Amino acid sequence: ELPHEKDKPVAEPIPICSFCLGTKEQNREKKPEELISCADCGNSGHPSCLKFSPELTVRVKALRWQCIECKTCSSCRNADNMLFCDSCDRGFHMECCDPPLTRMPKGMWICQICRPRKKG
Ligand SMILES: [Zn+2]
Ligand SMILES: [Zn+2]
Ligand SMILES: [Zn+2]
Ligand SMILES: [Zn+2]
């Protein structure tokens, strides 16, 4: 976790999925599933509705996660030219990546935090 994530207020979570309108007891298949909630605005989603894998779900539950609208660059601190890490869902401007990106990767992308550059 980044320092500026470890100390800040966490908004009250809204106990409904913004996607399916169900509670923790009813996802899209009407089965129970704990919500993930934005620490800034409190908006929630079922991990299944957010299309997160279980591994990502587990990682994000451990972090101060921001929803799509609240998301801020973890480098410079939304537009359409943000990248979201497929490991932690943090946002980074392409020009804020290390090294900087100029085109959308075809496949997966991971940030420096989840996989620091090989300093040999
Ligand atoms: Zn849902
Ligand atoms: Zn939010
Ligand atoms: Zn990451
Ligand atoms: Zn940035």
JSON list of C-alpha atoms and ligand atoms in Angstrom, two decimals:
[
{"chain": "A", "resi": 1, "resn": "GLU", "atom": "CA", "xyz": [0.00, 0.00, 0.00]},
{"chain": "A", "resi": 2, "resn": "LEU", "atom": "CA", "xyz": [1.09, 3.57, -0.75]},
{"chain": "A", "resi": 3, "resn": "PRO", "atom": "CA", "xyz": [1.51, 5.97, 2.23]},
{"chain": "A", "resi": 4, "resn": "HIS", "atom": "CA", "xyz": [-1.32, 8.28, 1.07]},
{"chain": "A", "resi": 5, "resn": "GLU", "atom": "CA", "xyz": [-3.65, 5.25, 1.16]},
{"chain": "A", "resi": 6, "resn": "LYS", "atom": "CA", "xyz": [-2.86, 4.17, 4.73]},
{"chain": "A", "resi": 7, "resn": "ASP", "atom": "CA", "xyz": [-4.19, 7.38, 6.35]},
{"chain": "A", "resi": 8, "resn": "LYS", "atom": "CA", "xyz": [-7.49, 8.77, 5.05]},
{"chain": "A", "resi": 9, "resn": "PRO", "atom": "CA", "xyz": [-11.22, 8.55, 5.94]},
{"chain": "A", "resi": 10, "resn": "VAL", "atom": "CA", "xyz": [-13.29, 5.66, 4.58]},
{"chain": "A", "resi": 11, "resn": "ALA", "atom": "CA", "xyz": [-16.84, 6.52, 3.48]},
{"chain": "A", "resi": 12, "resn": "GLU", "atom": "CA", "xyz": [-19.81, 4.48, 4.68]},
{"chain": "A", "resi": 13, "resn": "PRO", "atom": "CA", "xyz": [-20.42, 1.66, 2.18]},
{"chain": "A", "resi": 14, "resn": "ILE", "atom": "CA", "xyz": [-23.73, 1.50, 0.33]},
{"chain": "A", "resi": 15, "resn": "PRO", "atom": "CA", "xyz": [-25.08, -2.04, 0.78]},
{"chain": "A", "resi": 16, "resn": "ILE", "atom": "CA", "xyz": [-26.43, -2.44, -2.75]},
{"chain": "A", "resi": 17, "resn": "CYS", "atom": "CA", "xyz": [-24.68, -3.40, -5.98]},
{"chain": "A", "resi": 18, "resn": "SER", "atom": "CA", "xyz": [-24.82, -0.45, -8.38]},
{"chain": "A", "resi": 19, "resn": "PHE", "atom": "CA", "xyz": [-25.03, -2.97, -11.20]},
{"chain": "A", "resi": 20, "resn": "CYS", "atom": "CA", "xyz": [-27.67, -5.49, -10.15]},
{"chain": "A", "resi": 21, "resn": "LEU", "atom": "CA", "xyz": [-29.33, -3.69, -7.24]},
{"chain": "A", "resi": 22, "resn": "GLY", "atom": "CA", "xyz": [-28.97, -6.70, -4.96]},
{"chain": "A", "resi": 23, "resn": "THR", "atom": "CA", "xyz": [-27.67, -6.86, -1.42]},
{"chain": "A", "resi": 24, "resn": "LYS", "atom": "CA", "xyz": [-24.81, -9.03, -0.20]},
{"chain": "A", "resi": 25, "resn": "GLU", "atom": "CA", "xyz": [-27.44, -11.80, -0.11]},
{"chain": "A", "resi": 26, "resn": "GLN", "atom": "CA", "xyz": [-28.37, -11.62, -3.80]},
{"chain": "A", "resi": 27, "resn": "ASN", "atom": "CA", "xyz": [-26.00, -11.25, -6.75]},
{"chain": "A", "resi": 28, "resn": "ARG", "atom": "CA", "xyz": [-27.12, -11.61, -10.36]},
{"chain": "A", "resi": 29, "resn": "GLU", "atom": "CA", "xyz": [-27.68, -15.34, -9.84]},
{"chain": "A", "resi": 30, "resn": "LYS", "atom": "CA", "xyz": [-29.58, -14.58, -6.60]},
{"chain": "A", "resi": 31, "resn": "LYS", "atom": "CA", "xyz": [-26.82, -16.16, -4.50]},
{"chain": "A", "resi": 32, "resn": "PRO", "atom": "CA", "xyz": [-25.03, -14.51, -1.54]},
{"chain": "A", "resi": 33, "resn": "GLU", "atom": "CA", "xyz": [-21.79, -12.61, -2.28]},
{"chain": "A", "resi": 34, "resn": "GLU", "atom": "CA", "xyz": [-20.03, -9.96, -0.20]},
{"chain": "A", "resi": 35, "resn": "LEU", "atom": "CA", "xyz": [-19.76, -6.53, -1.86]},
{"chain": "A", "resi": 36, "resn": "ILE", "atom": "CA", "xyz": [-16.68, -4.51, -2.66]},
{"chain": "A", "resi": 37, "resn": "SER", "atom": "CA", "xyz": [-17.12, -0.87, -1.67]},
{"chain": "A", "resi": 38, "resn": "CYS", "atom": "CA", "xyz": [-15.48, 2.40, -2.72]},
{"chain": "A", "resi": 39, "resn": "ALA", "atom": "CA", "xyz": [-13.60, 4.02, 0.17]},
{"chain": "A", "resi": 40, "resn": "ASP", "atom": "CA", "xyz": [-14.20, 7.48, -1.29]},
{"chain": "A", "resi": 41, "resn": "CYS", "atom": "CA", "xyz": [-17.88, 7.51, -2.27]},
{"chain": "A", "resi": 42, "resn": "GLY", "atom": "CA", "xyz": [-19.16, 4.26, -0.75]},
{"chain": "A", "resi": 43, "resn": "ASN", "atom": "CA", "xyz": [-20.54, 2.83, -4.00]},
{"chain": "A", "resi": 44, "resn": "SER", "atom": "CA", "xyz": [-20.56, -0.97, -4.01]},
{"chain": "A", "resi": 45, "resn": "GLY", "atom": "CA", "xyz": [-20.43, -3.82, -6.52]},
{"chain": "A", "resi": 46, "resn": "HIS", "atom": "CA", "xyz": [-20.59, -7.59, -6.39]},
{"chain": "A", "resi": 47, "resn": "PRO", "atom": "CA", "xyz": [-17.14, -8.84, -7.49]},
{"chain": "A", "resi": 48, "resn": "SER", "atom": "CA", "xyz": [-18.97, -10.98, -10.04]},
{"chain": "A", "resi": 49, "resn": "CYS", "atom": "CA", "xyz": [-20.78, -7.95, -11.45]},
{"chain": "A", "resi": 50, "resn": "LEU", "atom": "CA", "xyz": [-17.48, -6.06, -11.58]},
{"chain": "A", "resi": 51, "resn": "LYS", "atom": "CA", "xyz": [-16.09, -9.04, -13.50]},
{"chain": "A", "resi": 52, "resn": "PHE", "atom": "CA", "xyz": [-13.21, -9.44, -11.05]},
{"chain": "A", "resi": 53, "resn": "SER", "atom": "CA", "xyz": [-11.52, -12.79, -10.60]},
{"chain": "A", "resi": 54, "resn": "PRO", "atom": "CA", "xyz": [-11.44, -14.18, -7.04]},
{"chain": "A", "resi": 55, "resn": "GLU", "atom": "CA", "xyz": [-7.72, -13.41, -6.80]},
{"chain": "A", "resi": 56, "resn": "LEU", "atom": "CA", "xyz": [-8.24, -9.79, -7.73]},
{"chain": "A", "resi": 57, "resn": "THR", "atom": "CA", "xyz": [-11.21, -9.69, -5.41]},
{"chain": "A", "resi": 58, "resn": "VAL", "atom": "CA", "xyz": [-8.96, -10.85, -2.58]},
{"chain": "A", "resi": 59, "resn": "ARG", "atom": "CA", "xyz": [-6.32, -8.26, -3.44]},
{"chain": "A", "resi": 60, "resn": "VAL", "atom": "CA", "xyz": [-8.76, -5.35, -3.72]},
{"chain": "A", "resi": 61, "resn": "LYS", "atom": "CA", "xyz": [-10.53, -6.24, -0.47]},
{"chain": "A", "resi": 62, "resn": "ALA", "atom": "CA", "xyz": [-7.16, -5.72, 1.23]},
{"chain": "A", "resi": 63, "resn": "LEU", "atom": "CA", "xyz": [-6.70, -2.25, -0.27]},
{"chain": "A", "resi": 64, "resn": "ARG", "atom": "CA", "xyz": [-8.26, 1.20, -0.13]},
{"chain": "A", "resi": 65, "resn": "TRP", "atom": "CA", "xyz": [-10.15, 0.76, -3.36]},
{"chain": "A", "resi": 66, "resn": "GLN", "atom": "CA", "xyz": [-11.71, 3.55, -5.37]},
{"chain": "A", "resi": 67, "resn": "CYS", "atom": "CA", "xyz": [-14.70, 3.15, -7.69]},
{"chain": "A", "resi": 68, "resn": "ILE", "atom": "CA", "xyz": [-14.47, 4.03, -11.38]},
{"chain": "A", "resi": 69, "resn": "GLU", "atom": "CA", "xyz": [-15.53, 7.67, -10.87]},
{"chain": "A", "resi": 70, "resn": "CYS", "atom": "CA", "xyz": [-13.41, 8.41, -7.79]},
{"chain": "A", "resi": 71, "resn": "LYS", "atom": "CA", "xyz": [-10.26, 6.74, -9.15]},
{"chain": "A", "resi": 72, "resn": "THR", "atom": "CA", "xyz": [-7.12, 8.90, -8.96]},
{"chain": "A", "resi": 73, "resn": "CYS", "atom": "CA", "xyz": [-3.68, 8.29, -10.50]},
{"chain": "A", "resi": 74, "resn": "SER", "atom": "CA", "xyz": [-1.47, 6.57, -7.93]},
{"chain": "A", "resi": 75, "resn": "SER", "atom": "CA", "xyz": [1.52, 8.42, -9.41]},
{"chain": "A", "resi": 76, "resn": "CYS", "atom": "CA", "xyz": [0.48, 12.05, -9.85]},
{"chain": "A", "resi": 77, "resn": "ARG", "atom": "CA", "xyz": [-2.52, 12.01, -7.49]},
{"chain": "A", "resi": 78, "resn": "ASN", "atom": "CA", "xyz": [-10.34, 10.28, -14.71]},
{"chain": "A", "resi": 79, "resn": "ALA", "atom": "CA", "xyz": [-10.75, 10.94, -18.46]},
{"chain": "A", "resi": 80, "resn": "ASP", "atom": "CA", "xyz": [-10.63, 7.99, -20.84]},
{"chain": "A", "resi": 81, "resn": "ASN", "atom": "CA", "xyz": [-6.85, 7.59, -21.03]},
{"chain": "A", "resi": 82, "resn": "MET", "atom": "CA", "xyz": [-6.36, 5.89, -17.68]},
{"chain": "A", "resi": 83, "resn": "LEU", "atom": "CA", "xyz": [-4.89, 2.43, -17.30]},
{"chain": "A", "resi": 84, "resn": "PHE", "atom": "CA", "xyz": [-6.13, 0.10, -14.59]},
{"chain": "A", "resi": 85, "resn": "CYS", "atom": "CA", "xyz": [-3.74, -2.52, -13.24]},
{"chain": "A", "resi": 86, "resn": "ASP", "atom": "CA", "xyz": [-5.04, -6.05, -13.78]},
{"chain": "A", "resi": 87, "resn": "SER", "atom": "CA", "xyz": [-3.46, -6.96, -10.45]},
{"chain": "A", "resi": 88, "resn": "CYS", "atom": "CA", "xyz": [-4.67, -4.23, -8.06]},
{"chain": "A", "resi": 89, "resn": "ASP", "atom": "CA", "xyz": [-7.05, -2.06, -10.13]},
{"chain": "A", "resi": 90, "resn": "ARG", "atom": "CA", "xyz": [-5.15, 1.14, -9.32]},
{"chain": "A", "resi": 91, "resn": "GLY", "atom": "CA", "xyz": [-5.33, 3.84, -11.98]},
{"chain": "A", "resi": 92, "resn": "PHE", "atom": "CA", "xyz": [-2.31, 5.34, -13.71]},
{"chain": "A", "resi": 93, "resn": "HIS", "atom": "CA", "xyz": [-2.20, 7.91, -16.52]},
{"chain": "A", "resi": 94, "resn": "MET", "atom": "CA", "xyz": [-0.27, 6.50, -19.47]},
{"chain": "A", "resi": 95, "resn": "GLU", "atom": "CA", "xyz": [2.21, 9.36, -19.20]},
{"chain": "A", "resi": 96, "resn": "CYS", "atom": "CA", "xyz": [2.54, 8.55, -15.49]},
{"chain": "A", "resi": 97, "resn": "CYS", "atom": "CA", "xyz": [3.55, 4.93, -16.04]},
{"chain": "A", "resi": 98, "resn": "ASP", "atom": "CA", "xyz": [7.14, 3.81, -15.57]},
{"chain": "A", "resi": 99, "resn": "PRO", "atom": "CA", "xyz": [8.20, 3.62, -18.29]},
{"chain": "A", "resi": 100, "resn": "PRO", "atom": "CA", "xyz": [5.55, 5.81, -19.97]},
{"chain": "A", "resi": 101, "resn": "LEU", "atom": "CA", "xyz": [3.04, 4.12, -22.29]},
{"chain": "A", "resi": 102, "resn": "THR", "atom": "CA", "xyz": [1.75, 5.58, -25.53]},
{"chain": "A", "resi": 103, "resn": "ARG", "atom": "CA", "xyz": [-0.64, 2.86, -26.70]},
{"chain": "A", "resi": 104, "resn": "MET", "atom": "CA", "xyz": [-3.17, 0.52, -25.06]},
{"chain": "A", "resi": 105, "resn": "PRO", "atom": "CA", "xyz": [-1.55, -2.84, -24.42]},
{"chain": "A", "resi": 106, "resn": "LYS", "atom": "CA", "xyz": [-3.13, -5.71, -26.33]},
{"chain": "A", "resi": 107, "resn": "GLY", "atom": "CA", "xyz": [-3.12, -8.02, -23.34]},
{"chain": "A", "resi": 108, "resn": "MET", "atom": "CA", "xyz": [-2.49, -7.77, -19.63]},
{"chain": "A", "resi": 109, "resn": "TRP", "atom": "CA", "xyz": [-0.88, -4.78, -17.91]},
{"chain": "A", "resi": 110, "resn": "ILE", "atom": "CA", "xyz": [0.62, -4.68, -14.42]},
{"chain": "A", "resi": 111, "resn": "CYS", "atom": "CA", "xyz": [1.77, -1.66, -12.38]},
{"chain": "A", "resi": 112, "resn": "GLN", "atom": "CA", "xyz": [5.13, -1.05, -10.72]},
{"chain": "A", "resi": 113, "resn": "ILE", "atom": "CA", "xyz": [3.67, -1.69, -7.25]},
{"chain": "A", "resi": 114, "resn": "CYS", "atom": "CA", "xyz": [2.51, -5.22, -8.02]},
{"chain": "A", "resi": 115, "resn": "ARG", "atom": "CA", "xyz": [5.65, -5.98, -10.02]},
{"chain": "A", "resi": 116, "resn": "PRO", "atom": "CA", "xyz": [8.60, -3.56, -9.69]},
{"chain": "A", "resi": 117, "resn": "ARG", "atom": "CA", "xyz": [10.82, -3.19, -12.74]},
{"chain": "A", "resi": 118, "resn": "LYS", "atom": "CA", "xyz": [13.80, -5.56, -12.84]},
{"chain": "A", "resi": 119, "resn": "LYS", "atom": "CA", "xyz": [16.60, -3.50, -11.28]},
{"chain": "A", "resi": 120, "resn": "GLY", "atom": "CA", "xyz": [19.66, -5.49, -12.36]},
{"chain": "B", "resi": 1, "resn": "ZN", "atom": "ZN", "xyz": [-24.36, -7.18, -8.39]},
{"chain": "B", "resi": 2, "resn": "ZN", "atom": "ZN", "xyz": [-16.26, 6.16, -5.47]},
{"chain": "B", "resi": 3, "resn": "ZN", "atom": "ZN", "xyz": [-1.08, -3.27, -9.62]},
{"chain": "B", "resi": 4, "resn": "ZN", "atom": "ZN", "xyz": [-1.04, 10.28, -13.60]}
]
